[PDB]
Structures are given as C-alpha cells and as structure tokens.
C-alpha cells in the first residue's frame, strides 16, 4: 500500500482513508490527476462512497474533501461518477452541519450549492436534517457572528436558498421545520442573540412576482413621499412554539444584545401597542392595591399591643377589630407574595451566577415575604421577637415600592441606578473598607490598656471609627491611652485614609456608573417594561386571552398551492423625501 | 538595527524589513551559522535587546515571524498546524521566552527598571499574553490561594495574641501554668517568626534588584510596605526584651500596617485588582502635593 499511497502523495501517475480521499486531500492547485485514474480503474473493477471510519472524523467522504477545497471541477467530477458524524463536526472544531449542501452553504460556495441542489445526475434534499435535527437554515443562522459583511452574506445565502427551495418545492414550508430541541430558524436567531439575522427575517420583502408570498414586511399604499407598511407577526406576539418576544425577554441574559434587540421594526412598536391598549390600566391598578396594602400594614404595625406576651386575646373595641382585620390582610398579602415568588423560580430555574444580576426586583419581593412568614411563625409560638421581623418586612416593602417606577421613563432610570451600585460599586468597596476599619480598630483597642467609658470594647471602638466616615466623630473620644502621640497619630492617619481618600474615591466610582447607566440604561428600562408587559399578559390569560390579541387578520396574497393567504398583520407608517 | 529602532509605523516597517532581508541573505550564504544567538559584550541577544530597550515593534516582529519560502523556512517562529475552513491553528517557538540560559524575554519585560516605555502593554504580543495566562491557570492559582490563606491565618494569630497581651507589670513576663498563657506564648512565637521571615524575604529582594532611589517607591511599593511592616515588629522585639513598655506602640503599628497590607493579595482579581492600584497612585501623586 505504501507505493500506491506514496505515488498518490507524489502526484505521479484505523483511520481507513482511501486513495481517493488521500489523493483529494494531498492535492496542490488541483493537480491530482491520478484521482480520475483511480476512479476510472475503480469503475472497471462503492469505492467513491467509502469514508473514514474513525470516530473523530467519522463519515467524511470524497464530496466533503472537494467541497472544503472550493474545487468546482473536482466536485462536479465526483458527483457525476452522506453525513460526517465525527466529533470534529459535532457541536478545536468546525461546525457546519452534516450534509454536503450544508458544507457548501456555510462556506459561501453559492455556485456549488446551486450545482448540488439542481444537479441533473443527483439532486440534494433541501429539508434533510442531521443528527441534531438542524436543517440548512439552522446551520446558516448558527454560523452567524454579527458582522456587517458576515451578516451580509449569511442573510444573502439564506435568501437565495429560501427562494431556490420555494422555486423547486413551493408546497413545503421550510422555515416551519424545527430541530430536536424544537426551535425554528427565527426562534433560534432570537434565542442565540444573533441580532442581524433576526432583523433580516422579521422585515424581509421579496419583490419578485410569483415568489412574493414568502415575505413579511409588505406595503399597503403610497400617495406621495409617504407609504404605509404592514408586517406579518405570525409567531411574534403568540404561537404554539415559543414566541420571539418571550424568548428575547425571558432569556437567561447570556444573550448579548437583549437590551437593544427589541429595536427591530415590529417589536419596538408592538410592545408599545400592548402598553397603551390594555396594560397601562393594569399597571396602575396593581400599583394602587400595593399602595393601599402598605397603609394597612403600616397602620396595623404602628398600633400593635405593647403589654404582655403574644398572642393577644381580642377586645370588644372597634380599634381592636380594625387591627385584627389589618393583620389578616397583611398576612394574606405576605402569603400571596411568597407563593407568587416561589412559583416564579420553578418557571425559570435561574442559575446562581445570574440569580442577582437578572432577577433583583423579584428576589427582593420574595425576601420581604420571608421576613413576615417568619414573624407569623414566631408570633404564635409565644415570642416577642416577631417585632424585629415585622419591622424589617415593613421597611423592606416601603423601599420595594420603587419597583413600580418601571413604567415611567424619567424615573425608571433612577431605580435602575440603585440596583447597579448596590451590586457592583458597594460590594467591592466594603471588601476594601472593612480591612482598614478592622486593622485600625484592632490597633486602637490594643493600644489602650484598660486592664463608664468602657472603650476597651472591639464593638465600641469599631463603631466610633465608623463615625469618622460620616463626619460625626469626636477626636478626643478617650483619655485612657498611655501614649498620646501614637493614639493621635493612628486616628489622624485613619481619618485621612478613609474620610478623605476612600469616601472621595467611592464617589468617583459612583459618578462613572451614573454616567454609564444614565446614557445606556435607556434600553434596559425598555426591556424591563417589556417583561412587565409579558407578565401582565400572562396573568390575565383567562379573562381576555384571545379578546386582547394584537394585530388584525388580513389578506396578503395567494399561497402557491392555490389557496388564500390570511395572516395577523401590524400596520406602520413612514415618510421619506429623498427617494421620490 | 534593533538599537536604531524608535517605534514608528514606517520606522518599525523598514527596520523590520531590513532585519528580515539581512537574516535571509545571511542564511542563504551561511546556513550553518546561527546569527541571532550571537551576543554583545553585555551578553544580550537581539531579541533580548529589543525586549530590554522597550522597542515594542521589533519584539512584535521577532516573536511572531513566519517566512514562507521553501528552503529558508527553518528560521521562523509562528508556524501553522492545520486549516480546515475559516479556522486555522498556529504554533509558536517559545525557545528562550519562558526560560533560558540567557535572560528570558518574560523576566526582562517584568523585572525591568520601569524606565522601559511600554512595559504595561508590551505583553500583548502573540505568545506572551497567553503564555502568562497558561501559567496562571495551570499551577499558580493554587499557590496564590495557599499563600493568601496562610497570611489570613497568621493575621488571626497576631491579632488574637496582641489583643490579649498582659497589662500588669513590666516586660518580659514569666509564664503561668494556664492554657491561655501557653496559647499566647505560641501566638507570639508564630508572629515573631513571620516577622523575621518577612524581614529576610524583603532584605534579599533589594540585593537582587538594587532599585534606584528615584524609582524606589514608584515600582516597588507593595514590597516596601511589607518590609516596613517587619521593621516595626523587630523593633518591638528589641524593645520588649530590654525591659520597656514602649513595645506596644510598635506592635500596634505592625498590626494596623499588616491588616491594611492584606490588600496586596487582590492582585489576582481583575475587578478588585484595579482598586488597590488606585490607593497606591493617590497616596504617591495626589496626596503629597
Ligand atoms: C384584591 C385583588 C388583589 C390582586 C391585585 C394584584 O396584582 O396586586 C398585587 C399586590 O397585591 C398584594 O400583594 C396585596 C394582597 C392583599 C390585599 C389587601 C389590600 C386590599 C385593599 C400587585 O403586584 P404584583 O405585580 O402582583 O407583584 C408585585 C411584585 N412581583 C411579584 C411582580 C415581583
Ligand atoms: C508554613 C508555610 C509558610 C510559607 C508559605 C508562604 O509563602 O506564606 C507567605 C506568608 O506567610 C507568612 O509570612 C507567615 C509565616 C509564619 C507562619 C505562621 C502561621 C501558620 C498557621 C505568603 O506570602 P508571600 O508571597 O511569601 O509574601 C508576601 C509579601 N511579598 C514578600 C510577596 C511582598
Ligand atoms: C476585614 C476583617 C474581618 C474579619 C477578621 C476576623 C479576625 C478576628 C480576630 C480575633 C480578635 C479577638 O480576639 O477579638 C475577640 C472577639 O471580638 C468580637 O467582638 C468579635 C470579632 C469578629 C469581627 C469580624 C467582623 C475579643 O472579644 P471577647 O473575647 O468576646 O471579649 C473580651 C473580654
Ligand atoms: C495634619 C496635622 C494636623 C494636626 C496635628 C497636630 C499639629 C502639629 C503640632 C506639633 C507640636 C507638638 O508636638 O506638640 C506637643 C504635643 O504633641 C503630641 O502630643 C503628639 C503630636 C503628634 C501629631 C502629628 C501626627 C500627624 C500625622 C498624620 C498622618 C506639645 O504640646 P501638648 O503636649 O499638646 O500641650
Ligand atoms: C440584594 C439584596 C438581598 C439586599 C436585601 C436587603 C437586606 C437590602 O440590602 C441589600 C444590601 C445592602 C444593605 C444595606 C445597604 C445597602 C445595600 O440590598 C438589598 C436590599 C436593598 C434595599 C433597596 O434596594 C433597592 O435598590 C430598591 C430597588 C431597586 C430596584 C428594583 O428593581 C427594586 O425592585 C424591588 C428595588 C432596602 C433593603 O431591602 C432594606 O430595607 C433593608 C433593611 C436592607 C436592604 O441586600
Ligand atoms: C508609602 C509609605 C511608606 C507609607 C507607610 C505607612 C506609614 C502608610 O502611610 C504612607 C503615607 C500616608 C500616611 C497616612 C495616610 C495616607 C498616606 O503610605 C504608606 C502607608 C499607607 C497604608 C496603606 O497603603 C495602601 O495603599 C495599601 C496598598 C496598596 C497597594 C498595594 O500594592 C499594597 O501592597 C502592600 C498596599 C497604611 C499604612 O501603612 C498604615 O497602616 C499606617 C499606620 C500608615 C500607612 O507612608
């Protein structure tokens, strides 16, 4: 075999590699003319279809070798006279699918895909799926990397393959096909964060006369420099499969461009449509009930009985009856919040690494309801430590009231700033501040002998050095030291190091954040409103699920089979002067 | 040729071009001789010289240079292994980069006197920026977390033995038949041993570098602080055996200084490693003016 392999390598006329595959691989400038001889010799004596049996490169055949090399003539010769299941092509490796046509499409080889698709000797199957279930369009969308030229040719190839498949097979619906996981090419582009492919798919009009029915953004009329466009909105607002809007919003936040992935033509106005139509009165009746429950909880916490031990027997007074009713309403609200929070994590199962960075408002609403259930537990088992939990519940809830500024734009970017500092710029600076506080507090408490004023306490001396950070500390707070020149050196060093060097450095860090999330979070607020709209829509499913459905059913054209095309469209308008 | 370099796009361009041409021509006439290995009297090599003098352009050229020609390809560093599609995996030569008989490129860039212009971003060249990471992940992230833990476990031996010091009489203090006194004595011994270790680890560091005074505080600040901590406690040892009660004023300074030096170990974290670099720069520049 060495002479044959050596001659094939010389280009002179386990792994399981064949001479044809070896010859094709070891070809320079397409000079491997011995491949024809082997194929011709093989014909005189199944050989062309032989493939490597190695698990790493399982399934690779001659067609793949020629396709990779961009050889039109070699590909045509091989075709005229399979799927690579190897770990190299499964999700150092390159994924393109597991079909020759997917190899052609994923590499921009437009001519080769045309040749394969309508190859007279053997045509390829457009709708075939690999092991993962991905079709061709799934591979094309997966390959996307969000670059102007990259998005350019991926969208171009998608459009070309789509038109060609429609021309050969008008009946079949290619986009509706799904992989094993269940997603569609549009849903996949929405989930994976590929903004370019989503922007293409959502608003794509193909002008050609016959194959116009596979388009979304139509036109209704144009009198002058003005024209009103439609949209298709098929699986956008709601569908059997996951909707584009829900996927973008309920995404794990690992998706790159979630915040500004809603600026595409339909979504940015479909979201607004829902907000104005039937949600602005359900985000103002939910705010009012919360404001009316925090005056039932506050007024019943402020007038709690002070004499004796709990529980307290009722008295024949109107005040006591009202207090009992207030307590019942408060506890009912607490239980409702606890369940509304418990059955939210089961729906998402958010990862710990992003438990606080994506659901902060909900974590807080849950943590509030824990403190009050703990109070219910402690108050019936004859304890008076239930006040320390009711108080925390009250303060936490009043400060959670800020969650409802989610609707306002000017104020919705002010409760987004208090989430971001408390997470990023106030947990670093307390790792870098307690070090100084404890170092100098241990120093000072060790210097003083003390072996009343009672400044021999590591608690009192840690506290008194924290009032040097709010500018409310007495320098001569003790006189028990034996070495004044050291004590008043330590304090004066501490004041400079923390009051003047650390506080005035944390302010700069918060200033940078305030700029950043003051000129960026304008889209995070829109996203938060989008989640609010989605949850509000989900809550009232029983009431007006179908009744409050966006978009109107309209005729678009004629399905190629001969029937009529009716779809749920959303109308938009525009004005343009320079085009005429 | 490397010495003449001044780090300009066109300047780097023709210096690199001339270097490549002279190298190829010398290889063609004399393939046997290794020209780069030659050194001047000081001992440096052209690559080591480009690394020491701060010439980033020549270093970037030399580290990753592939010459495609068929015969004279053996004088190259950045090869290629395979390319299936739009993907290709490159190699590198890393001959005297990680370690060598002559000074390594990595050590020269790091242990430089800091007069070198571009030290901070002179490690972005192809090999170094990932070779450094390789070492970090492979066998150093568990030696910068066992060195942090021992320091955190020694500052709870020093603090707990400083906080419970005897208050009655004059030093030294005779031992008592109590478990508390034995534990205090052990804490003192451990603390003093740590102090001596730090003092020697600091004294034999300056001999290795002999840093200039003008850049004594601008390049070794973390080490100056670790040394100054160990001086205060050796002074305390000196004063405490010679029957004085002024050793508390030094032990206290040692304790505070060490707790605040704990910040040196945020060197590994990225988000927190740029917060202890800000407290060095203000205290030097914006709080002495
Ligand atoms: C009665 C109808 C209550 C349901 C309306 C609603 O969504 O409210 C809710 C409040 O309502 C309550 O929690 C109060 C429950 C007790 C009622 C006593 C006061 C009555 C005077 C409104 O709020 P929500 O949007 O349900 O949840 C807010 C927090 N998450 C869960 C969105 C993060
Ligand atoms: C025992 C092994 C000690 C060596 C490990 C090491 O590098 O530590 C060292 C600390 O270790 C000590 O200084 C403590 C020494 C006394 C031990 C008592 C506590 C035991 C419980 C770790 O720190 P380092 O990196 O050696 O130096 C940090 C400061 N410079 C010198 C790098 C600037
Ligand atoms: C940043 C640093 C954060 C934490 C480092 C923890 C190291 C603590 C070292 C122990 C010092 C010590 O002995 O303090 C003891 C404990 O001091 C305290 O009050 C609690 C110390 C925990 C502080 C952590 C924050 C002495 O108090 P006592 O013996 O209860 O009363 C005396 C009569
Ligand atoms: C910034 C510093 C601002 C104020 C600190 C004190 C002002 C310096 C005056 C020096 C004169 C002096 O030593 O005073 C003597 C007393 O000095 C002392 O008691 C200790 C002085 C140490 C203070 C300097 C340390 C500052 C360093 C901070 C970093 C005599 O006066 P008396 O005994 O108080 O009566
Ligand atoms: C993230 C969590 C678990 C958190 C829970 C409590 C303990 C909390 O302290 C923090 C940390 C903290 C503690 C003290 C001062 C600052 C920060 O922040 C909140 C948490 C911080 C707040 C308010 O936080 C906010 O920024 C309001 C807010 C911003 C954005 C939102 O979308 C939002 O919706 C609920 C609420 C108030 C407290 O809940 C409160 O009243 C008490 C007693 C402590 C505050 O821990
Ligand atoms: C540079 C030197 C010699 C220095 C030595 C001592 C006296 C020091 O005051 C300074 C000047 C000073 C004094 C008082 C307030 C601010 C600054 O800064 C440090 C020095 C400043 C510090 C902490 O300095 C830091 O920024 C921490 C740090 C930052 C970056 C690092 O790489 C680092 O590694 C060790 C440590 C704390 C003290 O050591 C301390 O605890 C006491 C009692 C004085 C501080 O002189």
Residue numbers in the entry:
A (entry chain A): 114 to 126, 152 to 183, 188 to 223, 229 to 238, 243 to 602, 624 to 752
B (entry chain B): 291 to 579
Task: Give excerpts from the publication.
To address this question, we chose to study transient receptor vanilloid member 1 (TRPV1), which is the receptor for vanilloids and noxious heat. TRPV1 is a homotetramer, where each protomer has an N-terminal cytosolic ankyrin repeat domain (ARD) and a transmembrane domain (TMD) of six transmembrane helices (S1-S6). The TMD is composed of a voltage sensor-like S1-S4 domain (VSLD), a pore domain (S5, the turret, the pore helix (PH), the selectivity filter (SF), the pore loop (PL), and S6), and the amphipathic TRP helix. Vanilloid binding at the S1-S4 domain allosterically acts upon the pore domain, driving pore opening.
Various strategies of 3D classification of the 4 °C dataset consistently resulted in three distinct classes with nearly equal particle distributions to overall excellent quality. For the three classes of RTx-TRPV1 at 4 °C, we assigned class I, class II, and class III according to the size of the pore opening (class I being the narrowest). Notably, the models from the 4 °C class II and 25 °C class A reconstructions have similar overall conformations (Cα r.m.s.d. ~0.6 Å), however local differences near the SF and the CD suggests that they represent two intermediate substates (see the analysis below). Compared to TRPV1C,RTx, the 4 °C intermediate state (TRPV1IC,RTx) exhibits rotation of the TRP domain while the C-terminal half of S6 (S6b) rotates and tilts away from the ion permeation pathway so that the diagonal distance between the side chains of I679 in the S6 gate is larger than 8 Å, consistent with an open conformation for the S6 gate. Rotation of S6b occurs at the π helical region between S6a and S6b. However, the SF of the 4 °C intermediate state adopts a nonconducting conformation, as there is minimal change at the SF with the diagonal distance between the side chains of M644 of 6.4 Å. Therefore, because both the SF and the S6 gate adopt conformations consistent with conductive states and the M644 flipped conformation is observed in the final open state (TRPV1O, RTx), we tentatively assign the model from the 25 °C class A reconstruction as an intermediate open state (TRPV1IO,RTx), while assigning the corresponding 4 °C class II reconstruction as an intermediate closed state (TRPV1IC,RTx). We reason that the two intermediate states at 4 °C and 25 °C represent substates in which their energetic and conformational differences are too small to be separated by cryo-EM 3D classification. Upon lowering the contour level of the cryo-EM density maps, we observe density for both M644 rotamers in both intermediate state 3D reconstructions, but the density corresponding to the non-conductive conformation predominates at 4 °C whereas the conductive conformation predominates at 25 °C, supporting our hypothesis.
